[PDB]
Curated annotation (Swiss-Prot), chain B:
It comes from Homo sapiens. One of its GO terms (cellular component) is ribonucleoprotein complex. This is RuvB-like 1. There is a cross-link at residue 165 (Glycyl lysine isopeptide (Lys-Gly) (interchain with G-Cter in SUMO1)). Transmembrane segments: none annotated.
Curated annotation (Swiss-Prot), chain C:
The chain holds residues 2074 to 2190 of 3230 of the full protein. Interacts with CREBBP and EP300. May be part of a complex containing SRCAP, CREBBP, CARM1 and GRIP1. Component of the chromatin-remodeling SRCAP complex composed of at least SRCAP, DMAP1, RUVBL1, RUVBL2, ACTL6A, YEATS4, VPS72, ACTR6 and ZNHIT1. Component of a NuA4-related complex which contains EP400, TRRAP/PAF400, SRCAP, BRD8/SMAP, EPC1, DMAP1/DNMAP1, RUVBL1/TIP49, RUVBL2, actin, ACTL6A/BAF53A, VPS72 and YEATS4/GAS41. (Microbial infection) Interacts with hepatitis C virus (HCV) NS5A. The gene is SRCAP. It is found in: Nucleus. Residues 1-111 form the Helicase C-terminal domain. Belongs to the SNF2/RAD54 helicase family. SWR1 subfamily. It is linked to Floating-Harbor syndrome: A rare genetic disorder characterized by proportionate short stature, delayed bone age, delayed speech development, and typical facial features. The face is triangular with deep-set eyes, long eyelashes, bulbous nose, wide columella, short philtrum, and thin lips. This is Helicase SRCAP. Transmembrane segments: none annotated. Catalytic component of the SRCAP complex which mediates the ATP-dependent exchange of histone H2AZ/H2B dimers for nucleosomal H2A/H2B, leading to transcriptional regulation of selected genes by chromatin remodeling. Acts as a coactivator for CREB-mediated transcription, steroid receptor-mediated transcription, and Notch-mediated transcription.
Amino acid sequence: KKYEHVIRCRLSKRQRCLYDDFMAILMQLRKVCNHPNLFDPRPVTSPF
Amino acid sequence: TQRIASHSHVKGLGLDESGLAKQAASGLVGQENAREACGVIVELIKSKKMAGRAVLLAGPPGTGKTALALAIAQELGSKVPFCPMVGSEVYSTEIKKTEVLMENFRRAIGLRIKETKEVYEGEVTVIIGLKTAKGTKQLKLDPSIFEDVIYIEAVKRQGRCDTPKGDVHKKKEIIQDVTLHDLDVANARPQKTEITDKLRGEINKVVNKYIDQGIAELVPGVLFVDEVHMLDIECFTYLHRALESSIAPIVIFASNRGNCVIRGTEDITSPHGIPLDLLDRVMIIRTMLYTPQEMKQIIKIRAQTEGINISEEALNHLGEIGTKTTLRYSVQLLTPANLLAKINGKDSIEKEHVEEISELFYDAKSSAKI
Amino acid sequence: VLEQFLTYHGHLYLRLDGSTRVEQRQALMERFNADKRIFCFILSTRSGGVGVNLTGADTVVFYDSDWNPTMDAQAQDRCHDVHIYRLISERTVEENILKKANQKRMLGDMA
């Protein structure tokens, strides 16, 4: 016999700041809600 | 939450759209004339047309001119640079006396630079073949660089481990803000005293060549200068030429004492420690005198802001002890009274708690009487 | 993104994607027997449901909504110990997304 386990997760502060920045292509909005793939959360390696 | 911030009760200036200064707005309740004076100053900063003007602040010690400068700096935000400096910071031993006031006008002015650069994300192979998820391309590599991504501007190794997708050549637009004194230090220090012919001659011409066409963007800064009544007369001599210039940004001065003796001549007195040739070249701003109703109001606003709810009797005791000796003593009676309420277990602070704390700690006038 | 995360834990894994060649897929599929220091196996939704896969795989953990009817029903057919774990965000729009996905899967199963 096998069963399923339901585990619900929470969000963070920068993600909710991004959700505030959205309403401030509809298919591109669905990808960020899972993981921030379009925007860059990293201060990425930039040569000065 | 970082509780350490001293002057904290500030959201902005609180000026309305119709030009009227609202009293109960943005925390700083009071000083209507200073806000109506700085409403023209913030427009002078925002318009970015006229520059090289001095604004002197005067009044009793403890009128909140530092909170006013912080309110101006928070209205301007992170776009407009804000450089604070006191009068004792310009003095040094190995650094000459006429070097800090020279470099303040360069560290105040900022420049927005947008540059397009490339990144080669090649993996493994002087001929170095850069392998990607698209293909391999060979490049002629310099004999200087010998020892994942690299730095191609004018060499980060590894980056992966399997024994990194993307194209071979890329592009990206880096948008940064560089001050002119950072440009001067980078000129002096390749991969301190600035010589005049480079700092005034060539750097201004090459910044004009960057603005010259589309690229960058020049943003002036705000130089806050405190402790001017105890500054040397040679710094005043350089400041007279500093105000007589078209490339100098806006400088807000702050004076504390009423009358002083100028350090350097040690014989002549002067109001607010400033000679007549420099006091003619400033914009005099005068603060007002505190009332006990506004005193109790600002103590209540500071207490409600930080962490503390106070009943009416202890607020009356704080207002009386601020009317008698010191407002900042009434500021400092907040946290040990809260600690005594946490020790005794009270959720609020009564009259007995602030009475015992005022019995323990002493004043300045009370120490002068002893 | 997952290759940027999972390589900083001190473990080595492989790829099973929809961009490699067919002979590369065969050379990778011939090298899953008796793996060393490998506990995770990466598949996909379109290029992962091609056909015969590994039989000893357990602990199926899903990450995102598939936005297609009858997707996890094939996973339940292939798995039938295996525990199913899903990522559900709280107080978001994705609850109605999961409800609509469950309605589409029920309409696909009852058809």
